[PDB]
């Protein structure tokens, strides 16, 4: 709140002059309160789009204590000072058009300062528009056909045969950890497509719920959709390839727009943008483990080193220790070698509420995936580049930004490092011990705002 007042005129003038504002402010800086002051100064109501319903609560608890009338998600919202919604409400054309229509009783986007919170999530926005076909969905579709054949009583022989042909095709797909790009798949011929439309529409007139699920309909949508096609663990997945356009179209509104994050990534690119970086960001004691790595091809061979380091960190601490792994697979592979050390996992039986209660009453090694003395990054959250969908994302961002793919990978990794460290300390007065336990963390020292003089060595 030194930065709140000093950066306001810059932000106002950026927005008055037609720029889309990009705002970087580490967690705890109070991004939400600034954009809240921002709205009041521009004479617009505020409309914040966020990822999760949890963040929607945070917005409500802050607007209220500014004396602002607030709402979450149209006669109720119309008179509110601040409205909060989830991303689909802006970014899914059909959902956006139902809420922000042209008619009288519609909210108009032009009446708001629009905020995209946690805007780093836009890097993975290709996931939002993906569609999937699974074996189970196709078997489910075959029941829906049987129902229509046994009720409406018609012949959907061509559709059933196509589905069974698709089932056989999918049974031959290699089922490993990841997505594999595909050049094509068997699709319905013209007659079969005709029947599919018909049997789908009849089943839907059988669903006596208004907004109602159907696997035939999901099959139809998938078939009609344009996208890059993948085998992802034996399911077929289609990803539209125009996500960059989709993002700009959703933001194509004649009003003030802000995108913000505590890890605003270099690879987040918007037309006619202006970035403000709040550098006010507390007192981290940093260690570096130069002789260990979670690098995929070497990970197995490093498991014993991780297990020994973690036990050495647990014993020499007095409070509980947070440990973050790049994957659950890795977490578990290390966990089985920590016998004799008390261990807490999250979703494994335990709710966050329970974690904290145990922490106050004892010293635990808390193991998580990407109070307490120290936080350990047990490996680097490097993207799975052998996954073709992740790879396509990296290519897409490289092309948009004109940055090389190594620099995109770097950005994607740095986001996750920073968001993980940000979960730890959101109060300047925190004296958190950070263990950067992967040799590759040396490429990220500068991103973390830590000098190589300050860094201790741990082995």
CA 270 to chain CA centroid, Å, is 18
Would you say how long the chain is, in residues? 459
Experimental technique behind these coordinates: X-ray
Taking alpha carbons only, the member of 369, 328, 366 closest to residue 344 is 366
Contacts 24+ apart (CB under 8 A), 355-362: 359/319, 359/320, 362/320
Integer Cα distance of 412 and 69 in angstroms? 37
Q: What's domain 1-130+241-281's superfamily in CATH?
A: P-loop containing nucleotide triphosphate hydrolases (3.40.50.300)
Token pair listed for 104 = 């009288």
* C-alpha Rg value of the chain to the nearest Å: 25
Integer Cα distance of 22 and 105 in angstroms? 31
Taking alpha carbons only, the member of 126, 408, 405 closest to residue 268 is 408
Taking alpha carbons only, the member of 357, 306, 355 closest to residue 327 is 306
Q: Are 305 and 53 in contact (CB under 8 A)?
A: no
Taking alpha carbons only, the member of 283, 325, 318 closest to residue 432 is 283
| Residue 450 burial (CB count, 10 A) | 17
Give the CA-trace dihedral at 300, 304, 309, 315, to 10 degrees. 130
Pinpoint the residues of the chain covered by CATH 3.40.50.300.
Answer: 1-130+241-281, 282-459
Q: Are 265 and 207 in contact (CB under 8 A)?
A: no
Beta strand residue intervals within 12-92, DSSP E: 20-24, 45-50, 70-72, 82-86
SS3 373: strand
Q: Are 232 and 178 in contact (CB under 8 A)?
A: yes
Residue 456 pairs in a beta bridge with 287
Q: In what order do the strands lie in the sheet with 112-116?
A: 70-72, 82-86, 45-50, 112-116, 257-261, 20-24, 273-277
Q: Are 21 and 14 in contact (CB under 8 A)?
A: yes
CATH topology of domain 131-240: Fumarase C; Chain B, domain 1 (1.10.275)
Contacts of 407 (CB under 8 A, 6+ apart): 266, 267, 398
Taking alpha carbons only, the member of 32, 64, 55, 28 closest to residue 258 is 32
What are the start-end ranges of the H helices in 86-129? 88-91, 93-99
Q: Are 263 and 277 in contact (CB under 8 A)?
A: no
DSSP state of 452: T
Q: Is 282-459 a CATH 3.40.50.300 domain?
A: yes
Token pair listed for 363 = 């010293």
CA distances from 334 to 55, 217, 303, 416 (A): 32, 43, 6, 21
């Amino acid at each position: 709140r030194q930065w709140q007042a000093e950066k306001l005129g810059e932000a106002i003038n950026a927005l008055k002059h037609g720029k889309t504002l990009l705002l970087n402010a580490k967690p705890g800086l109070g991004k939400t309160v600034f954009v809240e002051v921002l709205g009041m100064q521009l004479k617009k109501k505020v409309l914040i789009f966020t990822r999760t319903h949890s963040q929607l609560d945070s917005i409500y608890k802050n607007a209220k204590l500014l004396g602002l009338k607030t709402g979450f998600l149209r006669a109720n919202l119309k008179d509110k000072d601040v409205i909060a919604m989830t991303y689909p409400y802006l970014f899914q054309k059909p959902i956006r058009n139902s809420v922000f229509c042209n008619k009288d009783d519609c909210l108009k986007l032009e009446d708001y300062l629009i905020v995209i919170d946690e805007a780093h999530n836009l890097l993975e926005a290709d996931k939002w528009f993906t569609r999937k076909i699974s074996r189970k969905m196709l078997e489910r579709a075959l029941k829906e056909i049987e129902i229509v054949e046994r009720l409406n009583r018609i012949d959907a022989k061509k559709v059933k045969d196509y589905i069974n042909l698709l089932i056989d095709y999918m049974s031959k797909l290699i089922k490993d950890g990841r997505c594999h790009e595909l050049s094509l798949m068997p699709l319905p011929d013209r007659e079969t497509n005709g029947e599919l439309i018909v049997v789908t529409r009849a089943y839907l007139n059988i669903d006596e719920g208004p907004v109602k699920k159907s696997s035939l309909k999901s099959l139809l949508k998938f078939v009609e959709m344009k996208g890059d096609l993948y085998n992802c663990n034996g399911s077929l997945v289609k990803v539209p390839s125009d996500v960059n356009q989709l993002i700009e179209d959703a933001l194509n509104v004649k009003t003030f727009k802000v995108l913000m994050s505590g890890t605003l990534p270099e690879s987040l690119t918007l037309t006619n943008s202006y970035k403000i970086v709040v550098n006010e960001s507390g007192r981290g004691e940093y260690y570096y483990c130069p002789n260990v790595t979670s690098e995929l091809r070497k990970r197995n061979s490093n498991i014993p080193i991780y297990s020994i380091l973690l036990k050495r960190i647990y014993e020499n601490s007095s409070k509980s220790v947070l440990v973050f792994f790049p994957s659950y697979e890795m977490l578990e592979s290390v966990r089985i070698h920590l016998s004799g050390i008390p261990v807490i996992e999250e979703n494994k039986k335990t709710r966050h509420e329970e974690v904290l209660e145990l922490m106050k009453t004892g010293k635990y090694l808390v193991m998580l995936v990407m109070l307490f003395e120290s936080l350990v990054l047990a490996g680097l959250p490097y993207p799975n580049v052998s996954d073709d969908m992740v790879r396509k994302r990296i290519e897409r961002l490289s092309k948009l930004t004109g940055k090389d793919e190594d620099s995109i990978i770097h950005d994607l990794t740095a986001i996750v490092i920073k968001q993980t460290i940000g979960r730890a300390f959101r109060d300047p007065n925190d004296y958190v011990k950070i263990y950067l336990c992967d040799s590759r963390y040396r490429e990220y020292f500068a991103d973390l705002g830590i000098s190589e003089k300050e860094i201790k060595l741990f082995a």
